[PDB]
Amino acid sequence: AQNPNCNIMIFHPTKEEFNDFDKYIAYMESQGAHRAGLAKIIPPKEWKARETYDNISEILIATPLQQVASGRAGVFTQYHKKKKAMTVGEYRHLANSKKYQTPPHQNFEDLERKYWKNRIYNSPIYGADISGSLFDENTKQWNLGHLGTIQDLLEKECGVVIEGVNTPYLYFGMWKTTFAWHTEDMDLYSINYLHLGEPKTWYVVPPEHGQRLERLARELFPGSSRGCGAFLRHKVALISPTVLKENGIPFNRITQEAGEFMVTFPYGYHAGFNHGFNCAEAINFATPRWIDYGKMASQCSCGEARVTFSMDAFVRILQPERYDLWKRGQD
Template sequence: MSYNKAPTGDNLASVAPIDKAQIEKALCVEDKIGEPNLTSSPSEAAPISFVKDTSINKREKKQLEKKMEQEKTETHTKPSTPLKKTTRRRKRKVKTSYDELGISYEEEKMLSLAIKNSLREKNACSNQDYSKVKEMKTFYPSEEEFKDPIKYIETLFHEGAWKLGCIKIIPPASFKPGFSFNPPQDKRMPTRFQTLQDLSQGRSFDQNEDGISYSDFKVMAEEFQTKHYEPYQGLSHEERTKEMEKQYWKYVEDNQGERICVQYAADLSAKEFGSAFPSDPSDPYSSHPWNLTNMDRLKNSMLQICGGEKISGINLPWVYAGMLYSSFCWHYEDVMMYSINYMHTGEGKMWYAIPSQDRAKFERIAKEKLAILFDEDPNILLNITAMVSPAYLASNGVTVYKTEQRPGQFILTFPESYHAGWSTGFNVAEAVNIVMKSWLDYGLKSVNVYLKTREKVPVFSIDWIVVENIRSIAYGDEHDGPHVKFDDVMTLQVKGKPLRYNAKLDLWNFYVDNILAKELCERAMIRSHFNDKKSLFKTTIKKFPKEQVESKDNIECFYCIHLCYLSYVKCMRCKKIYCISHELQCGCPQERIKIFERYSDEQLMKFKEDSKRNILFSIEPAKDDEKVIIIDE
């Protein structure tokens, strides 16, 4: 029988079921690797074993017995004499090299991981116990609460809803926006192909480069849906969804049944394809605060500094056209922002959420379950291509919530909350990110996460959003940017009691403690470092070039991919840019560098003083029964 190389890379998922005893035996002989045991029966190929074959034939057995008998006789008949030294050395057993086995070290390592993963999945694949997965909490805002989305969400945050990870919001019955998504026939939507059995393998999605029109996608999705709904005829909506959920995770986790491939039209720019919310100025919903295209311009939104300019991935809504089993894998939002998702039309979407306090636990369990993927790429979760069953996570102590989102309902994800899901049929949804005061600490945390991984570039700089909001508060309409609007004091109803909430003052404290102090300290250190070496360096401090000031493109540190908004250091030889925390790492002869600053030290300090004066001027004294919030509780 010819020797087959061990499966590697993409085909590890195809490893045949392996006998448990054989696996344990193989794992216990790590230091006794010999020639592979390749015996097999005609009906079934034997599992690959690296145990030394010690079997001998009859002739060798007789010779060995005869020799042992002679040695025994000599021991009893010959007088004992001192042993003579001999030049013959005992033949040393040589460990068989990986080349002789036909596999490389990396392949053997991957096979070992595959065996361990196979054992883990064998015990987990039948886990369909959703009793430990909790139902996501639903909120029903009143007409009054529904008038101000930012204020309502801030209230929920201070009430402790952030501990739930995600929540469902069902608006008042009066909220009925029309459905306006209808791209022209010649406008083709990019889609991604998703094979359900590959979702647990973390493979990147193939892209439909030719795209598909919205009308053709809808026809395809409804035909697929009709075919796969047949086994559930006669069941109620709840019963059908429950059975479909079990089937979905069997496809994903157990690789059962035929290979199912679906398409998902995700991240469709509302600027290019249009929003599904009404846009006609004569329609009152075109200016409604819960129309996601207006979220960034709302009072108390920190994205007002965009000045109405829509920037993809920040304040520009994305439309999602899904079909049965279209999936979005586990992730949290860029820079840990809030996100809000509205279901416009179609069938439901299953959501799973993990609160921020369980983020580390989720990542540890996912790393154990997807050991092979994490061995290849420690930052696999940043790719948003891996699925893990909520039942498996819950059975391992991770807090998981789930719900089905229906048309007309919102899903709000809180900062740092992992979430995932899949569609129960054809549907169209829309989502956008939100940035408000309660996000600031999460934004700062996300910077540290990105610096640690050095794999993902933030969609925007935290310095940008904080400094420009402070600058606007300081000068209002006098400066050349948009005028942001914050309530001087918001009165939130937290746990039935009024709570005075001053977002401006909180923002000012954050600027002083986390942005201004750090920036001024690092500038002083780098100036001191280079000024001590005047003979080696010719250091100049310059303002940002005009094209960089006006450009929306981010300036990345070559070393740590940190976004350099307030300052950076540039090597004038190789032209590489570094943040002032990492100076120059290029190794060039450092004959001349330049330090670029967007704002001088004096300007940054003036922002601090002028904004503080305006904030204190606007604060009203609190009533006896009100509490003033300076920093988050």
């Protein structure tokens, strides 16, 4: 069995290997990359996402989110307080202000220590989930707006044509902006490209061990767990690496830098934080191997998770027994 310890693997495809996206995902899986839940892909030196980032300041962040924490430093939830609209240029200035800027630090490990010690005492503002793309239309390789759609994959595997669309999303981050522990909708893959700026640190639980994380979360967030049998779908709970190690939960960590892709694999729980002002692009995708994960994915039906239009068909076709309850939670 490849990668039996479920380590995060790092790949360096050549320009020739960068042509066929699906083939390369399958290659990484042949080497056991999915066992980690997360892989890094460093593009060939010949590749670029676009020519420059000099002209992005007028992008609008319609609903910046202030991420307010509750709990203790290693075990907390965050809620998202909506803020007034601002441009990317305005947000960048805000990220660089004394109130929000990255502190002095020695290295990524010192900054990680500072994040976990201090995150709860601040409320950073995240420009998340903005429909759009920064790939040039002429970038033909690993262009996250030109991937095969999940609707087409389901149709190719299962024969059923479905409604829905699959487009990318932009994330503008600052120091301490945080992504809570989650798997993707319908336990899909995700791919994330860090276009510019400061790094993003990731934590990940191997898919084979995801239920260990779920059981810890139920213990640590006992009110939330009574509320909803899949409350990690709410994407609000954080657990630090120190707490995970104290509780024996298998996980790994890695820092993504500008110019690098990360891929999350079906049912790979992940969480993390941004180091400073940055911009990422991410989208969900599927492969044939996903279908069995999609059929078994948990679902939130309490009302909280509320998701895209295109999840309807995935539930309806892959999980018909759960569909009526789930759709009630959507309404």
